[PDB]
DNA sequence: AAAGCCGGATGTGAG
DNA sequence: TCTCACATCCGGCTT
């Protein structure tokens, strides 16, 4: 968690700690489908994790959208705040 | 309406 | 350096 520096890694570690389920949680752990339960809250954690000021979900969602073309994380269509990891942490590296 | 999601255009700071 | 990995902003589309 603390050693993490990329957004996909930080999101993955929060999804591994049950103390953060009210921010972000698995909906299908095997398929690596997760839901962002608190968009504004998760953005606050991401900004604090990067020692940054004024991090918002609008800006953080843009970073997730860059993962679309890179085949790292894809958004489940038609659903709200439902995303899917396309690669394991090893496949991304 | 108004908020959620999209990708373009550019900035930025670390490596 | 350029590249990388977002960060910042925004108009257009969608819900």
TrEMBL record:
It comes from the Eukaryota. Residues 5-86 form the ETS domain. The lineage of its organism: Eukaryota, Metazoa, Chordata, Craniata, Vertebrata. Belongs to the ETS family. One of its GO terms (biological process) is regulation of transcription by RNA polymerase II. One of its GO terms (molecular function) is sequence-specific DNA binding. It is found in: Nucleus. Keywords: DNA-binding, Nucleus. Its main location: nucleus. GO terms for cellular component: nucleus. Coiled coil: none annotated. This is Ets variant 6.
